[PDB]
Amino acid sequence: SVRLSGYCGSPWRVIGYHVVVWMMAGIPLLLFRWKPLWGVRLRLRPCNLAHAETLVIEIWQLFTVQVQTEVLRYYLFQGQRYIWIETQQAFYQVSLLDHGRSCDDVHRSRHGLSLQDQMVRKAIYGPNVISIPVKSYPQLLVDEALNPYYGFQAFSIALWLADHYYWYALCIFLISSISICLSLYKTRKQSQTLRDMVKLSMRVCVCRPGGEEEWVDSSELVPGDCLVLPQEGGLMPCDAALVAGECMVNESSLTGESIPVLKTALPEGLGPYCAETHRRHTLFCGTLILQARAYVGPHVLAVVTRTGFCTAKGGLVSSILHPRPINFKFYKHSMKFVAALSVLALLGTIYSIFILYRNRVPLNEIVIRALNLVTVVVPPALPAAMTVCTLYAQSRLRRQGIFCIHPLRINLGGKLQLVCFDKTGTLTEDGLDVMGVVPLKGQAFLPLVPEPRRLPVGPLLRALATCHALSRLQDTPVGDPMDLKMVESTGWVLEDSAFGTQVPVPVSVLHRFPFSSALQRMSVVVAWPGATQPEAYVKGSPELVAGLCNPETVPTDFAQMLQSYTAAGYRVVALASKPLPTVPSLEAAQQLTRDTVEGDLSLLGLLVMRNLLKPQTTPVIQALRRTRIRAVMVTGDNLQTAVTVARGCGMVAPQEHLIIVHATHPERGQPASLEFLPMESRSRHLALSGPTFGIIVKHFPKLLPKVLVQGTVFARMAPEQKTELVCELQKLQYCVGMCGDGANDCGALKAADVGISLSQAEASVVSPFTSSMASIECVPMVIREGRCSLDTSFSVFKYMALYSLTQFISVLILYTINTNLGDLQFLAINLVITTTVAVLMSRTGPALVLGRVRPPGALLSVPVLSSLLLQMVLVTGVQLGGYFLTLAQPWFVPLNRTVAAPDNLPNYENTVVFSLSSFQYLILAAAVSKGAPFRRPLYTNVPFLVALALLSSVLVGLVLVPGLLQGPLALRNITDTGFKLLLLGLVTLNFVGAFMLESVLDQCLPACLRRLRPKRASKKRFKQLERELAEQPWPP
C-alpha cells in the first residue's frame, strides 16, 4: 500500500510560506516536524503528477521526495529509482523495467550494448553504485540537535542563565553535548561501516557489440550490458547472469556460505529469467569468483541484470539503511505515563506559583522560577542514558559473538514468544555423517560397523574409498558433501586418480562414470597393484542398485532394513561391485560402456549416513521449552526426517503427541480435505508439509489459526512459504524469532522480529542479527540480553522519573521557605551523581539463566506506578522529616526570608535538604537496579558499585568533615555532631525503606493484583486460541 501526491512548483506560495514560518514563531516549525503534511500543503500547491516537482509518499508514514529531470523525470525513494513513463503516465521502479524478459532475451543481449544505448540506459538506471549517503558533521549536528528535547534543553539553559545559574547552565550544556556526541558517534560509526562495506570500484571489460571489447569503470555498468570475467576470477561488481562458461563463486560476502558453488551458463529457453529459478546461473554483486573456465569460446561472458540497489546486496543494504519500523511498542502507554508524571509536575508548579506569590517575590522572578521548576523534571541526561543502555547491550552481544545492525531490535529479543529453526545447518550438522556401514557375507547383511576404518581390505572398502567423483582443487577435496564425507570417513587420501592406503596398497581409478540426477547412481572403474583384474564399484539408490546386483546376492531383508533405516531419519546408499575380465590398463578401461559396468553387479554392502544433531541443539531447545517459548522447526527437508529431528532435539518430547496434518488438493469432483495422521513415539503438536500449509492457507482460513498455534514441524516448505509462515504467526501477535542460517531463509529472517544467522563474520549483512557460532546457543543469549535490555531500560526510565520527582520535591520544599537549591549544588546533583549513576546503571549484564517470567511491557503498570508513588512518598517523607527535625534543633537559625536565593545561601535548610536529597539519588539508583530474574545482581557491575561507594563516601564527607566543599557548594557548616549522626541515620532509614519497599512490591503486589482483579482474558490472539483449544481440542 503506497500513495503518491504530486505537487507542482509555485514561487509566490513558497516565498509566502517561507516568510510566514520564519517570522511568525517556532511553534509552526515544531508542529510541521510533527505533522509535515500541513507544511507541504501550505508550502507547495497540489497538481497533476505529470507536472509534479516534489512528491509525497505514504507507506502510515510520510516521506517527501523531490523529482529530478534529465528528458527523464525520476525520483529516488529509499535508494530505489522510479522513472516517469510517458506512455503509462506513472512512476515505475527501474527494478521492473526489464522484469520478465526470457533467457533468450539475455542470450540475445549477450553480444553487448551499444554505447549510445548504454548511455541512455545509464541515464535511466543510474550508476552501478550502492551509494551510502554520508553526512558531514554539521549536517549530523543539525539533524540531531534540532530535536525538540534539545530545544527544550537550550531553552532551559537560557532560563538558568537568566537566573544567574552559570554552573548549572554549564552542566545542562555539557550533558546535552554528551548526548549529542554519543548520537553522532553511533550514527557516524554505522554509516562509515556501511560505506566501507559497500565500497567497490573496479575495471571490468565489457563486450561492446561489433566484436570489440571495451574496458570501463565498475560504476559504468548498466543492465543488459555484457561482462567478461577474468579467467582467474575476481570480485563481482554487478548482478549478472552467466551466459557462456562456468565459474567457482564464493558467496560468503552475500549469503554467508563459504563453500564454492558451481555457476553454469544460462540455459537457453523461452522461460522468463529469474534470479531465484536461475540462481545457479546468476552471479551476484559482491561475491568472489574463485575461478572461471571458458569451455566454449575464448572467454567467459556474463550479462548484467541488476546494478546499484537493484542487486541482492543492494536490497540487503537498502534494508539496513531503511529498516521496516519496529511493530512492538515496548513502552505501552508511555505517553500516558509521561502525562501522569506531568500532572504531578503541574500540581507542583501551581503550588510553586501560589507559594512564590505568598512569599511576595516580584512577578518576573515568579515566572522565571516557575519555568526553572518546570525545566527540573525534564532531565538533560535522559537521551544520553537511553542511548547508553542500547550501546551497552550491543557491546555485550558483540563480546558474546552476536552482532546487531539495529540495536533497538535487541529489546525484541525479550519479547520473543516463538522461535523458528531451520533444520539443517542450524539444528543439525551442516552435512551428513557416517553412522554405520552394512557389509554382507554371501546373502546376509553383516552387523553394523560404526567406523569404516577397521574394515578388512577388500572390494567393499575400496568401493567406499574410491567410488566417487572428487577433484583435488588447491589440495582440498571439493564437490558433493555426500562424497567428501564418505571418502574422509574411509581415511584414504586422494593422490586419472589414485588413492593411498591410510596405514594395504594404493588403488587407481582406471575410469569414472560421473553421477547423474536422473540415474540416482554412479560408477567407476578401479584397479590396484596386485589385482588380477579391475573392479567396478557402483554406489547409488539401494532399490535400483539391488536390481543391477545379482538376486542371489541381495538378501530378503533388504527392503525391510532399508525402510527401518529410512524411517529413523537416515540416508542409505548401496555399494556394489563386479569383477571386469578386461586387462587392467588406462586405455582398455576407458572404452567400457556405462551399461556394461552398471549391469551384472554384486551387492557387497550398504552405507547409512544420517545428518547428526548438533550437541548444543537439544539443551537449547529444552531450555526454550522450559521457558514457555515455542520452538517451531521450519525446514525444507523431508517430513519424516524433520519429525525425527524434532523428536530428537526435544521439540516434541516423548510424552507429547504428534499429529501429521495432510491436506489433499481440491481435484475435480471433490473439495480440499484435511486428514490427521496420529503418530506414536501445549502437549499436542502438529506436523505438516509445505503443500499442506499452502492448501490450508488457501482453502481453510478458519482452521489456519489453530494449525499455526499448535504447529511444531513445518517440512517441505519453500522460502516464500517460510516468509508466509512468519507473517501468519506474527498475525497472531506472536513475537517471532527466526534462527535460520541459510541463504534461503533470507526472506524469513527479514520478515521475523528477530532474525539470527548462525555462521557469519563481523561484517555480515544477511540478517539483523548475525552470530559467529555454529550452534543455536545464540538464541538464548539473544533472549537473555533482550530481557536484560528491557529491564535495564525500564530501570533507567524509573530512575529518571524518580530522579526528577526527587529534585522537583527538593526545589518545591526550598521554594516554600524562600530559598533554592543553589548553583553548584544543581551542578553536583545533575552531573557528578545522577549522570554518572545513570550511565553506569545500564552496564550490568543479563542473567545467566533463561527463566519463565517475561519482562513487562507497560510503563504505566500498576506495579511500576505504585513503585514510583511509594518511593516518592518515602523520599518526600525523609526530606520533610529532616527539614522539620533541623527546626527542632537549638542551634538552628531561620534563613533570611527577606532576600531570595542564592543571596541567603548558605543556610541550614538548604544544607539539610541538599544532603538528604543527594543521598536519596544514590539510594534510588541502587533501588531501581533489580537483579534476578532478568539481570545480574548489582554488585557484579564494578563501575556502578564503585560509583555508588565513592559518591556515598564523598557525600558522607560533605556531611561530616567540616570545611570540605562547603565553600563552593555553599553549604552551611553544621557544628553539631549528634545532628549529623541523626541525619545519617535518617539516610540509612531511607536506604533500608527503599529496598524493603521494592522487595515488598515485587513479591506481594502481583499476587494482590491477581487476587483483586483476575484478568478476564488476554488480548493476544494466540493466547485466546490456546484457551479455545484447551476448551475443545481441534483435531479429534
CATH number of the structural domain spanning residue 858 = 1.20.1110.10
Find where cell 597393484 sits: 529
Q: Both 353 and 476 in a single domain?
A: no
| Nearest C-alpha neighbor of 125 from the set 29, 31, 219, 5 | 219
For 585-598, the DSSP string reads -HHHHHT--HHHHH
Cα four-point dihedral sign 613, 616, 620, 623:
positive
Cα–Cα distance measured from residue 1001 to residue 1011, given in angstroms and rounded to the nearest whole number: 15
Q: Both 289 and 374 in a single domain?
A: no
Q: Both 270 and 418 in a single domain?
A: no
Domain boundary among 772, 804, 826: 772
Q: Is 473 left (phi over 0), alpha (psi -120 to 50) or beta?
A: beta
Q: Both 423 and 439 in a single domain?
A: no
Domain boundary among 290, 321, 352: 321
Cα–Cα distance measured from residue 264 to residue 280, given in angstroms and rounded to the nearest whole number: 7
Residue 105 lies in a domain: no
Cα–Cα distance measured from residue 334 to residue 343, given in angstroms and rounded to the nearest whole number: 14
Residue 107 lies in a domain: no
Q: Both 270 and 352 in a single domain?
A: no
Compute φ and ψ for 670, nearest 5 degrees.
Answer: -150, 155
Cα four-point dihedral sign 406, 407, 408, 412:
positive
Residues in the chain: 1036
Q: Both 439 and 423 in a single domain?
A: no
Cα–Cα distance measured from residue 829 to residue 851, given in angstroms and rounded to the nearest whole number: 37
Which of helix, strand or coil describes residue 37? helix
Number of Cβ within a 10 Å radius of residue 142: 11
Q: Both 448 and 366 in a single domain?
A: no
Q: Both 213 and 259 in a single domain?
A: yes
Cα–Cα distance measured from residue 414 to residue 437, given in angstroms and rounded to the nearest whole number: 46
Number of Cβ within a 10 Å radius of residue 403: 20
Residue 42 lies in a domain: yes
- Radius of gyration from C-alpha coordinates of the chain: 36
Q: Both 790 and 918 in a single domain?
A: yes
Compute the C-alpha angle 198/199/202, nearest 5°: 120
Strands 657-664 and 684-688: parallel
Residue 884 lies in a domain: yes
Residue 467 lies in a domain: yes
Can the peptide bond before residue 260 be classed as cis, meaning omega within 30 degrees of 0?
Answer: no
Q: How many CA within 13 A on the CB side of residue 750? A: 20
Catalytic status, residue 422: yes
Provide the CATH number for the domain around residue 548: 3.40.1110.10
Residues 6+ apart with CB under 8 A from 195: 132, 134
Residues 6+ apart with CB under 8 A from 809: 348, 872, 875, 876, 879
Domain boundary among 49, 81, 97: 97
**745 known member of a binding site:** yes
| Cα dihedral 745→751→756→761 (10° resolution) | 70
For 963-978, the DSSP string reads TSSTTTTT------SH
Compute φ and ψ for 652, nearest 5 degrees.
Answer: -125, 90
Cα–Cα distance measured from residue 836 to residue 175, given in angstroms and rounded to the nearest whole number: 11
Cα four-point dihedral sign 86, 91, 94, 100:
negative
- End-to-end, the C-alpha distance of the chain in Å comes to 40
Cα–Cα distance measured from residue 464 to residue 604, given in angstroms and rounded to the nearest whole number: 11
Cα–Cα distance measured from residue 786 to residue 227, given in angstroms and rounded to the nearest whole number: 46
Answer whether 711's CB lies under 8 Å from 663's CB. no
Provide the domain limits for residue 47. 1-97
Q: How far is CA 539 from the centre of its chain?
A: 43
Q: Both 593 and 642 in a single domain?
A: no
3-state helix, strand, coil in the chain (%, to 5): 45, 20, 35
Residue 512 lies in a domain: yes
Residue 507 lies in a domain: yes
Point out which residues pair with 301 in neighbouring strands. 228, 244
Cα–Cα distance measured from residue 42 to residue 832, given in angstroms and rounded to the nearest whole number: 47
DSSP E strand stretches across 488-620:
493-494, 497-500, 507-516, 521-527, 535-540, 572-579, 602-610
Cα–Cα distance measured from residue 99 to residue 829, given in angstroms and rounded to the nearest whole number: 63
Compute the C-alpha angle 420/424/429, nearest 5°: 125
**903 known member of a binding site:** no
Q: Both 648 and 758 in a single domain?
A: yes
Answer whether 825's CB lies under 8 Å from 367's CB. no
Q: How far is CA 315 from CA 162, 307, 312, 738, 763, in A?
A: 52, 11, 5, 19, 16
Run of H or E including 293: strand 288-293
Cα–Cα distance measured from residue 79 to residue 319, given in angstroms and rounded to the nearest whole number: 10
Cell of 708: 499455526
Answer whether 479's CB lies under 8 Å from 471's CB. yes
Cα–Cα distance measured from residue 791 to residue 857, given in angstroms and rounded to the nearest whole number: 10
Q: Is 212 left (phi over 0), alpha (psi -120 to 50) or beta?
A: beta
Answer whether 707's CB lies under 8 Å from 696's CB. yes
Strands 73-77 and 80-85: antiparallel
Provide the CATH number for the domain around residue 646: 3.40.50.1000
Cα–Cα distance measured from residue 668 to residue 828, given in angstroms and rounded to the nearest whole number: 82
Cα–Cα distance measured from residue 921 to residue 834, given in angstroms and rounded to the nearest whole number: 7
Which of helix, strand or coil describes residue 348? helix
Number of compact structural domains in the chain: 5
Residues 6+ apart with CB under 8 A from 200: 130, 218, 235, 237, 286
Residue of 422, 483, 637, 823 marked active site: 422
Answer whether 92's CB lies under 8 Å from 82's CB. yes
Cell of 658: 504428534
For 263-292, the DSSP string reads EEPPPPSSSB--TTTTGGGEE-TT-EEEEE
Cell of 226: 555484457
- Experimental method used, please? cryo-EM
Point out which residues pair with 507 in neighbouring strands. 499
Compute φ and ψ for 607, nearest 5 degrees.
Answer: -115, 125
Residues 6+ apart with CB under 8 A from 912: 882, 883, 886, 983
Residue 777 lies in a domain: no
Number of Cβ within a 10 Å radius of residue 344: 17
Cα–Cα distance measured from residue 617 to residue 428, given in angstroms and rounded to the nearest whole number: 8
- String of b and e for 940-961 (b: at least 16 CB within 10 Å)? ebeebeebbeebbebbeebbee
Q: Both 465 and 550 in a single domain?
A: yes
**Residue 296 has what DSSP assignment?**
S
Burial of 47 (0-12, 13-18, 19+ CB in 10 A): middle
Find where cell 545379482 sits: 550
Q: What is the resolution of this structure in A?
A: 2.9
Which of helix, strand or coil describes residue 958? helix
